[PDB]
Paper text:
Finally, we report a 1.01-Å-resolution structure of NdIII–Mex-LanM, which rationalizes Mex-LanM’s shallower RE selectivity trend. EF hands comprise 12-residue, carboxylate-rich metal-binding loops flanked by α-helices, which traditionally respond to CaII binding;29 in Mex-LanM, however, EF hands 1–3 bind lanthanide(III) ions with low-picomolar affinity and 108-fold selectivity over CaII, resulting in a large, lanthanide-selective disorder-to-order conformational transition. EF4 binds with only micromolar affinity. Unusually among RE chelators, Mex-LanM favours the larger and more abundant light REs (LREs), especially LaIII–SmIII, over heavy REs (HREs). The metal-binding sites of Mex-LanM differ substantially from those of Hans-LanM. Although the NdIII sites of Mex-LanM share the nine- and ten-coordination observed in DyIII– and LaIII–Hans-LanM, they structurally resemble the seven-coordinate CaII-binding sites of calmodulin. The increased coordination numbers in Mex-LanM relative to calmodulin result from bidentate coordination of D5 and an additional solvent ligand. The observation of the two solvent molecules per metal site and the hydrogen bond to the D9 residue validates recent spectroscopic studies.
Residue numbers in the entry: 29 to 133
Write the structure that this text describes.
């Protein structure tokens, strides 16, 4: 779950596209019943039930891929307070960085 796992272009950092691509792959593997959404049971250990509600604007109890990717973007921004478009190893290790990793691993 280090930088290298999420950095296909070998610049040493994760950009928003790289985080989103990893988030999409994580979404797909976290939805084995192929309904196109993630519920609290599927996200256990990564996103708590309390945090899921905050990420689900239409309050249907699940996250579709668009909602999940929006959550990835919000967590990327939260882990990148210098607003420089990339997450480095220091930022990935931060508490906010760990929450990004839990969405995209
Ligand atoms: Nd990169
Ligand atoms: Nd599902
Ligand atoms: Nd929803
Ligand atoms: Nd940065």
């Amino acid at each position: 779950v280090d930088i290298a796992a999420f950095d296909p272009d070998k610049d040493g950092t994760i950009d928003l596209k790289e985080a989103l691509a990893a988030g999409s792959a994580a979404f797909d593997k976290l939805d084995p019943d192929k309904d196109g959404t993630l519920d609290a049971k599927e996200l256990k250990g990564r996103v708590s039930e309390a945090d899921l509600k905050k990420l689900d604007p239409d309050n249907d109890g699940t996250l579709d891929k668009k909602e999940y990717l929006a959550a990835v973007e919000a967590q990327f921004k939260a882990a990148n307070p210098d607003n420089d478009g990339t997450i480095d190893a220091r930022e990935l290790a931060s508490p906010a960085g760990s929450a990004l990793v839990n969405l995209i691993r």
